[PDB]
Structures are given as C-alpha cells and as structure tokens.
Task: inverse folding
C-alpha cells in the first residue's frame, strides 16, 4: 500500500513526556501516547509526495491531533464491527507500525507509558485503536496482562 | 481584511493588513508540564502556548516548533496558529486571507505544508507565502537595496534592485538570535552562573536582549573590560539573585561577525553582506552599498549598525558610499512590509485561492510565490 | 619527577608522572568533630581529611570541598592538597611540577585560584591544569574518539578527532555520582531505610558501588523484579543490620539515562553523547561513533557499557558501527593519562613556571591551558 | 624524462611524458586546521595537501589555490607543486623538464608567475606552458576539430583546423564543475539538506559525480520526475545519513546548457560551441561540426554527449553531420596529450630553457608558448 | 622606494586562521601571522613589473615561505647589529607596511593574534622581524605591553 514510506529517525523523542508527569493526577496517557505515535509516524520528506499524501490522510483519520476527532473516533470504535472500512484502515496502519525502523524504541516507550501512566490499565478492554497500536509495537499482545507491579507489603 | 502572520523562529507577529503594527506579539513556544501537578482541578491542560507558556515556564518544558526558520513540529505549529487566530486575533480564519512569511532557501516541503494546513485545517479563503527580506524592503519603502534579515533562527541576505531580486546572490546563514542565546549560556559558565540546562534558556535570552551590545572595536572593548571593569553590568534573576556580566556583553554578539566561537566555518554577517553584493551585477553594487537595510530582532543590538558600517566600508572600495539603514521599528519591519503588501490593490490577484489550491494541490505555492 | 592529576569531586588521585597507577587515592573529604570533647584524648585535631575521616565518620560532619566539579571551600581544599603532598606522597611540593585536572566549562575563577594556591601557598616550581576528558584519551592511547567522563560531580563529553577538540561540541551535565547516591538514599526510604546526611551517605555510596548495576532493558528488568526475587540482594550495615535491596539497585543508575527521575530536564548520557556527535563535522562522526571512550568511577556500573552501546546504536544510522571502549582501569584513566602527559619530553615546554606566573598573575592559566 | 603536470582547478594530474595515464591524481586543495589543540604531538603539521587534506577533511578548512583556471593563492600553489614533485612523483624537479597546462585567455601574470616559480623555486632545467584544449586534440590524435574542455574551474573551446588555431574564435566561460557543485548544494536545500562547510562541499561534489546526469530533453525529464519517483536515487553520507534526490540529479548539469540557472547571462555550452564554429572560416565549419571533441571531468556526465549532439544539430544547418567525440579517457585527455607532446622529438626545441629565462626573464613565456 | 606598488584588497582575509585554532597548543603564532602579512603584501598584478620584481625580492627575503629560510632569517636578526643590509631591508619593508591601504584591518588581525595566540607574549624581547612588522601596523609600539587579560578571580 505505502511503498517507500520513510520516517525521520528520533523525530518522536521530544514528544515523550517526563516520567514524573506520567504520574500526574490528570495525566491523559492515551492521548499523550498516541501523540508520540502520531509524531513517530510523520513521514519523512524523502517519501514520494503521492505516498506522503496518502499516508498522511490515513494517520489523520486514525491518529488525529484534534481532541474532538480523537474522542469521536474512540466512540465510533466502540462498535468497530459496524465500520468495516475503519477496521481495515487500522489494520493497514498497524502494518505500518510493525515495520517501523524504530519499533523497538516505540515499544520501549509504550511499556514505559504502561508502567508509569497506566496506559494499559483496562487490559483486555482497552480501546480498539489503542490496543491495535500496541499490538503493532508488541506483537505477542502480552501487554494486555504484562504490567507486573512490584509489591512492598509482606515481602522478604 | 487580510491577516499578516510573520511566524518567525522566536516570535509570532500577527495582525491585520493595513495596521501599522501587529496586534499580537507572543513567543513561538509550546510548553508541556514536567512535574506531577498534583492537585484536583489543576493542570488539566496538556500544553500551553505563547505568553501563557512563558508565564508558567517554571514547571514547563519549552519547545520551539520552528528551528532555523524551518518548522520541525507541525502539531505544535498548528497549536500556535490556532492560538494566533482564535485567542490573539479573535477572528474566524475562514473569512480572512492570510499572508505568511518564510526565509529564502527553505525546504520546499515547509511552504508546501504551510499551504496544506492553512487551506484544510483552517480553511482560509486564500493565502500567500512571502520572503521575509522582500517584505522588509516594503516596510522601508525602498525598491532597491540589500536586506539583512536576522531573527531568532535564520540570517539571510537578499539583494533587490528596482524590484528585481537576484536569487543567485541570496545568502543564508543558520546563525541568529537563538545561536547567540546558546553561546551566551556557554560563556556565562565562565563565571559561576551555570544555567547549563534547558529550564532557564529564556532568562538568558532576556539577559541578551537587555545587556548585550556590539563593540565597534572588539579588541579595544576586550582591553577595556580586562582593565577598568567599567563595562560590568548587573542583572537580577527571577529568584532575586544578581548576576554581574562583563565582557560577555559584547562577546556574545561578536559571534555574528566572527561565526567562530561556536565552531562555524562561515564568514561574519559583514562579509556575507559584502559577498552577496559582489555576486550581483557590477552595475547595481553602488546602489546596494548605499541601501543596506537591516531588519529582525537580532539587528537590535546597540552599535550593530555602526559596526556593520565600519566592517563593510573596510571591505568595499574606498570610493563607495556605505550606508546602513536601521529603522527603529526594524524588529517589526517584516510584518509591516507584509501589511503594506497585503493591502495593495495590485496584490489582490497574487493570492493563492482555495479554488486554485484544491485544483493543483500544495504544489501551487511554488508557482505563485517567490 | 612531577606530581600528577587530580581534582576529583569524590576522590583524590595523587602520584608521580611515569607511574602506572596513583600512589594514594583516599576520598576528598574534610570532617569536623561534633557532639564530643569530654574526654582528654578522644581526639585532639579539629579536622580530619580523606582516610581516617572515613574511619571516624561516626563522630564527624563530612563535607566535600568540591561540588559538581567546582571547589566551593578553598580552606578545606588547601587542607586536602596539604594532606596529599605531605601526608600521602611524603614529598615537598616546592621541588616537583604538579599537574592538576578540571572539568570543561568550569568557572574560570576555579582555575585561577587553583594556580594561585599552587604557586603561592605551595611554591610549586611549575604546574598545569588539564581537561579530564583529554587525559582519558591519553590513557586509552587514542588520538580520536569522544570520551564520556563521569566521576562524582560531573559527566562531560569531549569529542577529539586527531588531537583536535571541537569545543563547541563539549557537553556537560551536573549529574554523576553524588546525585545517584542522593537518589539511592531517597529511593531506599520507600524500602524502610533512612540514611540521614553525611555519615550514612557514605554507607549509601558504598552500597551503590557494591550492588548497583545498569539494566540492559529497564522495563523488562522492572517486570522481573516485580514478579520474582532473583534480583534481591542483601547488604550488611556497619552496625550489623542487613538491608535487602531489589529493583532499587538498577533504578539508581537508571537516572543516568532518564535524568527526569531526579527532576532534571536534560537528556540522558546516551543522548548527550549522541548530541555531542551531530555537533561535530559530518566527516568526523564515523570515527567518533567508534572510539566511544568511557572514563571515571560513575562508568563502573556493570552493564553500563552494553546499555550505552545499545542506546547509541539507536539514535544513530544503522550502518554506523557503535563501539564503546570501557577499559578496566576506567576509574583511573584520567590519572593514567595525566601521568603519560606529564612525563612526555615534548610536554616539558607546556608547563607554566613560577617565572611566568609572577609576570602574568593567575590569569596566565587561561592562555596556557585548555 | 619530462614531467607533465596538468594543474587544473580541481585536480592535479601529474606524471612522466610517454606514459598512458598520469601517475598521481589528487585534489588541488590545501586544508588547514580550524579546531583547537589539544594533544601534545598531534598538531605540529599546519596545512595538508591533496589526499591527506581530503582524508582529514573533517577538521580542516579546505581551499583551492586555483579558481576559474587562475592561480589565486601562490603560496598554496607552491605547496601543491612541492607535494607533486617530492611526495607524489618522488623526483628532483631540477633533473626533469616540466610541461604544464593552462586555460586560454588567462591573465598573463598567471603564466609569468608559474614560469618564475618553476625556474627560481624548483630550478627546473626547462618548462613549457601549453593550452589544455590543444593537448586534448593531441590525445584524440586528430589535427582538426573544435575541442570543448570543461574541468572544475573554466570551460572553453578552441577551434583547430589542420593544426592551426583560430584565436579569435576561442570561447571561455567561468562555468564549470565547481559552479555546478555550488548550484547542487543550493538546490539540495529544497529537500532540507544543508551543506555549508568546505568539508561538506566535497561531499556534494561526490554526490554530483555519482548521481548527476544530463537529460536529453529537460522539460520532459522535469515532467517525469514530477509525475513519478523513478528518477530518485539515494546516497549515503559519511556519517550514515541517507539523502535522496530527484530532479536535482539532472537540474545541476542543466546549468551547463542554461547558465541562467545560476544567474549568468552567458549562453549554454551547446550554443557557445556553435558560436565558436560560426566565428571560424566558412570553409572549415563542416570539418569542425564533425570533430567536436569533449575533454575534462565536467564532460563526464552521462548523456552529455547525446545532449550536445542534439543541441548543436538543432543549431547547425540540417545538411551538416554533427559528431561529438567523447573518449572514455576524457578526464585525462589533457594530460595524455601533454605526455604525447612532451615526448615528441620535434618538440624538444620548443622548451623554455633555464638559459633562455635568465636572458629574457618571465616574459619569455609569452614568446615561446601559445 | 616602491612607487606605484598596489595590493589586491581583502586578499589576506582567507589566510587568517579561526580563533579556535589560534588556541591550539602547537599553534605557531609567528609563522602563521607572518603568512598573513606576506599574503597581504603580495603585489597586485596592476603594479608595474619592475616594481613587482623589486618588491617581491624584498618580501621574499624578509617574509620567506620556507620554514628553513624563515628560521635562518630569525637567527640572523638576533645579532642585527652586524647586518646593516637587513636593517635597511626591514626598514624599507616597514615603510611599505605602514602605508598599506588596509593597515587598519591588518592591525586588527595582529591584535587578534596577540590576544588569542600570544603573538606578542615575549613583549619587548620579540624578534626583530616580528617586532618591526608590528611597529609598521601599530605605530606607537604599545603592543610591546602585552594584551590586557580579565583575571576572573577576586572579581567584585
Ligand atoms: N533589543 C534586542 N537586543 C538584542 N536582541 C534582541 C532584541 N530584541 C529581540 N532580540 C532577539 O531577536 C530574536 C527575535 O527576533 P525576531 O525578528 O522576532 O525573529 P523571528 O522573526 O524569527 O521571530 C530573539 O531571539 C531575541 O533574542
Ligand atoms: N564499582 C562502582 N560502581 C558504581 N559506582 C562507582 C564504582 N566505583 C566508583 N563509583 C562512583 O564513582 C565516583 C568516583 O569517581 P571518580 O572518577 O573518582 O570521580 P572524581 O574524579 O570526581 O574523584 C564515586 O562517587 C562512586 O560513587
Ligand atoms: N564522473 C563524473 N561525473 C560528473 N562530474 C565529474 C565526474 N568526474 C569529475 N567530475 C567533475 O569534473 C571536475 C574535475 O575535472 P578535471 O578535468 O579534473 O578539472 P581540472 O582539470 O580543473 O582538475 C570536478 O569538479 C568534478 O566535479
Ligand atoms: Mg523574523
Ligand atoms: Mg574523575
Ligand atoms: Mg582539466
């Protein structure tokens, strides 16, 4: 679909919030994390314009930087079964993510979000868009039950 | 009426065409909280823009969407433009043509994406991307002269004669106010003032704006600073602490004329201006020598106009008449020229229209704009 | 023979040029007695320095004359130097050239007063102040490479290509040991151990030196600690109590790569090293990606080299061959380089002599040393 | 044996008369360190010449002593020649006559000085200054034809018929490889690639040599590049970064046929060649049309010969047979011809001997050499 | 002595080293600075040939390219009292320097060399050739008192 799509290396590092901020009372892990992925997926200008224009439309729909559109897409995904085109679009984006040249760093950032900001707090009941993005970064899907938290009470 | 938005690397100058000064002048920064909050009902805003970010910078990580005149964070640049239109100008962008500016020799994708955002995200009826140096000449009112535009990110020279630009003679130098700010941070560590962190880059920018100046003779100034201590000046930080600064006052702006001290191989702004003139036709050089127009915040250092006059006079043949034009409003000259250009009747056919855009795509910007 | 390099924030390293290792290390500590004095014989001296101040730490208030590479108590620093020359090296300083060290981007008054004390209070025939990163390269034997030197007060990067340093690419973070130590004692409170200031800080430093390590994958290591007890390890306090430390023994050095753990806004040491590169010339980066030299005690954590190898392999083009050079004598690389440098016959001209000092005063050190 | 030194603007091709290829081919650059210090025994060598300067390019400021076929820095040129004789050829110049080349219509002081240096600085027994275009004809083996020599500094064509040159028909354009290199780095900024240093200019030169080609029809090629990505090629920079260029591949060489791209008013090389032929006697124009011989590195672009064939055929009358001769050894045609000329027995009387120079001085060159 | 002698203006600027390199521990301030003066004194091609050849011999002897010749001249000037011909040549060259059309800029470069590279660190004991060149650029000879330096310590 997107042949020759290229990404700017390390373009997403500035978007990662401070670890201390991830513990904030009103931190929005989902939107902040999807902001990192949206920045990570910003095609490099080296990409041919036709591919750049096509992909930008895809990530605009699935990863909009506008809050009201992100909320609407989330609600529109509560019945993903009723939007076959949306399901296919997310699969196509999911395919792009899993091939990302820095998927390892993005997966590392995703796990940091999960442990610090509770990104995967809902586990299996995580939103369709967020769950599929995490699936691309972490193929096995273990993130659904992977946030092992240390306990200090009653330990040797 | 049309909107004139001089994005700039450091400051956003926005307003309406026909006004003598921009309505809104705020930093081009977006701040994200660093710390944990931590009260209920506090810190629900994920980001702050412009003056609000500057006010809250103590608990924010400040980031400039534009670096070296090039937009590097388009999601943040969208935030700044949204702030400019809705919170600073309080206008509906769908009703007003928007005149934008950028430096010459920028990446084509920068202005291609500027057009796309304006027509799709903001749905402006029409827009236009002007070269900042050209606008400065509009503000000066001249039709001939070589403009030295130096803002926060880019310093570029554009020679213009009788309204004709010589693009092959355009010089661009990625050394501007922000680079001077970083150097001032570096040499301030020679004394005990170790800002040495991204938190206080704005405080030393204020120090630079308040105290730094260009020495007419660098060697004499260095000797005077070493001998007398009469050049020492004191600055009070927000903490109430007082820092004394001596020869760093004129060493920081000296980087403009000696791009060394920051490891740059290029020549100073005086030689870049002279080299630009010498690349032009021999018949227009005399008029260029007498019409050195200076614009941008980085040209606001006291004594820079005198220094430029001395330095170019030493390079040009003695019979030539060197004249530096440094208007008091040269900090807003680019926006003023945009306002003049946007309000011209002859310009109303130069706009890129919405109909033209969706017929041709973002590539239309290259055909209709210099 | 010449006495040789040290200005360490945490440790002194004194010896003779030409030797393979310092003859005396001892901590850079000056302790003052507290809450005692009843017995006529339970201590007559009013201050203890280095070794035998660690021994008496229980009844003393320890404090370092050097904080983040900068000496902040010249009365105590003179005591440490006096202890070094007379009680450790058993030499007379007035007949031995002495080579000292300094972190880059330090306050210049630091060097000026260092040379003033050496020539006036110690009457050394000649001296010299070297940059610790440069010496580390001498010890490694290279003339090319970027050296990441991190001791007890400062971590800094100095890229050198062919003996030529790129001063604009020097990076310095006031984040090294003594900040990991402070974080560790803070992080030990949640486990149930207090370790209040001074005497207990040294205990925490020892447990950091013995048990702490850098995890190759922090998130994976964090899960392992949570789900198992294999990473748990116990340490015996001087009074016989045993403390069990689990994930705290890789979170403490993790602050080197995530300085936001301790509230710092700067980037980690891996990004700072990569940022030091990409400020050098493009033709130099390939040789700097290799020859990534580690030095200083803070680089002695197990697995720090592999983590930095992994981290810098990211952030860099896949075709580049990242190579981290971490010799076993990292902790004394600076001293070894100083011994090599001070023993070179060609270096004997670079000494600043008593004759030059009294002619030019303390400022001479700036125009004679890097 | 005689030495043939083709000291072009960009490359020094040197060797012994009678050989088929030059023995030494290295860049005509002198690089001096621009960074600091800092290691004892690693900075004694000031200035590097030729390939050594190119290898240490990252820390040096490269400078060409020859610009537009004119030696501008005679101290550096002396270094280049000394490097050629003693370090590259390993010969004593006092034992070998030296044949060297220069472009036509050069300043006469250029020949006078190089004659002065060869006899007084190198004590060469004899020397000769030949025209590069004439030597190319020697290499091709013809005695008739209009040569088009384009190197790094200057492009010129010298029409020769039956061994007779028509000096009134010589053409000279200060538009050659270096001007193309500078244009390429200017239009590379359109894609966000910034090359500003002299070190990076060499990388842009390599990119040009590796990827640039001449389009048979420029407008069609521009349309193809705009409509598809088939013309894009990727290039790996020394530090591992990968850059991709599309229409810049053939836009840079297009400046040869459209000098207005770089602001020059001159005509393209195709039209200049036709103008030179049209200035010749009508009876010899037919022979010239069929013997256009290309030489120099700037004629090594793929498709240049076909483009010149097409362009001249559209200017010449339809009944003429336009033939472009572009031997694969184009890049060394001048040196090969000089080697042929220097080894001719009938040429041994055309040398400028040391005795002749003594009586007549440097002005002897104007009498003995074309 | 040299009437009609002209120089190409700004010819010497390319020869001035970067300030960063002036701080190199093995920087040769004298040879590098004399290279700037030699380049600045290169006669313009518009000068009549008899003057050019006459002057080129003067600067070639007093400002040779070769390090061996430059060092030999340096030693021979240590006892300049026994070399009147050099006294006349150095005096003649100094007269040309003081009338150089860009003496002001050459003075600035000389002061930069002294400030950064320690060109005049020997003060009054500077060698004859270098001292005369500086006296030509700096008539009063104040450079003999070395550059003033900051002396950061004990600052108010
Ligand atoms: N009075 C002043 N003196 C010195 N520098 C100034 C002054 N005013 C502004 N500046 C500098 O100019 C820069 C902003 O200039 P400006 O023309 O607004 O650039 P831009 O158009 O890119 O925003 C800032 O980085 C600031 O440091
Ligand atoms: N094996 C080790 N593991 C972890 N940290 C160590 C180890 N050895 C020393 N350190 C740390 O390194 C610091 C000493 O480094 P050093 O190079 O001596 O600094 P300085 O040059 O300032 O004396 C101490 O603060 C200590 O905490
Ligand atoms: N294969 C190539 N393709 C395109 N340009 C080339 C090629 N080889 C060399 N050049 C250009 O030719 C110039 C060198 O040509 P040359 O004949 O050596 O000139 P000179 O005689 O002045 O050294 C260089 O500037 C280079 O950019
Ligand atoms: Mg501006
Ligand atoms: Mg150390
Ligand atoms: Mg050639």
Result:
């Amino acid at each position: 679909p997107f042949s020759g799509l290229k990404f700017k290396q390390n373009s997403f590092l500035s978007t990662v919030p401070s670890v201390t901020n991830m513990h904030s009372m009103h931190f929005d892990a989902r939107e902040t994390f999807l902001g990192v992925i949206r920045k990570a997926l910003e095609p490099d200008t080296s990409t041919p314009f036709p591919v750049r224009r096509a992909f930008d439309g895809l990530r605009a729909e699935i990863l909009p930087n506008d809050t009201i559109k992100s909320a609407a897409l989330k609600a529109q995904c509560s019945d993903i079964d009723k939007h076959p085109e949306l399901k296919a679009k997310m699969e196509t984006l999911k395919e792009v993510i899993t091939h990302h040249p820095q998927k390892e760093k993005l997966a590392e950032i995703a796990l940091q979000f999960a442990r610090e900001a509770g990104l995967t707090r809902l586990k299996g009941e995580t939103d369709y868009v967020l769950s599929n993005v995490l699936d691309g970064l972490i193929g096995d899907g273990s993130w659904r039950a992977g946030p092992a938290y240390e306990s200090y009470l009653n330990k040797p | 009426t049309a909107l004139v938005c001089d994005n700039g690397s450091g400051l956003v100058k926005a307003g309406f065409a026909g006004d003598d000064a921009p309505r809104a002048v705020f930093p081009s920064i977006v701040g994200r909280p660093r710390h944990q909050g931590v009260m209920v009902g506090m810190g629900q805003k994920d980001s702050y823009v412009g003056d609000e970010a500057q006010s809250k910078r103590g608990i924010l990580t400040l980031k400039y969407p534009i670096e070296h005149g090039i937009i590097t964070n388009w999601d943040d640049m969208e935030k700044i433009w949204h702030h400019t239109f809705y919170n600073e100008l309080r206008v509906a962008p769908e009703e007003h043509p928007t005149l934008l500016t950028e430096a010459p020799l920028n990446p084509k994708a920068n202005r291609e994406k500027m057009t796309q955002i304006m027509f799709e995200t903001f749905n402006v009826p029409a827009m236009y991307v002007a070269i900042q140096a050209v606008l400065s000449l509009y503000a000066s009112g001249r039709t001939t002269g070589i403009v030295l535009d130096s803002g926060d990110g880019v310093t570029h020279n554009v020679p213009i004669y009788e309204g004709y630009a010589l693009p092959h003679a355009i010089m661009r130098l990625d050394l501007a106010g922000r680079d001077l700010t970083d150097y001032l941070m570096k040499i301030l560590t020679e004394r005990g003032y170790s800002f040495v962190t991204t938190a206080e880059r704005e405080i030393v920018r204020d120090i630079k704006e308040k105290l730094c100046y260009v020495a007419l003779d660098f060697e004499n100034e260095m000797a005077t600073a070493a001998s007398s201590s009469s050049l020492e000046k004191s600055y009070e930080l927000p903490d109430g602490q007082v820092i004394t600064i001596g020869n760093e006052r004129f060493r920081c702006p000296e980087t403009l004329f000696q791009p060394s001290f920051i490891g740059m191989e290029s020549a100073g702004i005086h030689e870049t201006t002279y080299n630009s003139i010498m690349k032009c036709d021999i018949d227009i050089r005399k008029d260029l020598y007498a019409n050195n127009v200076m614009s941008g915040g980085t040209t606001m250092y006291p004594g820079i106009a005198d220094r430029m006059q001395k330095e170019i006079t030493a390079l040009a043949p003695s019979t030539m008449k060197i004249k530096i034009i440094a208007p008091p409003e040269r900090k807003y000259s680019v926006w003023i020229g945009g306002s003049i250009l946007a309000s011209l009747s002859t310009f109303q056919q130069m706009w890129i229209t919405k109909q033209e855009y969706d017929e041709a795509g973002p590539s239309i910007v290259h055909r209709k704009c210099f």
Observations:
- The helical segments of chain A are 19-22, 29-40, 49-62, 67-76, 84-98, 103-117, 128-137.
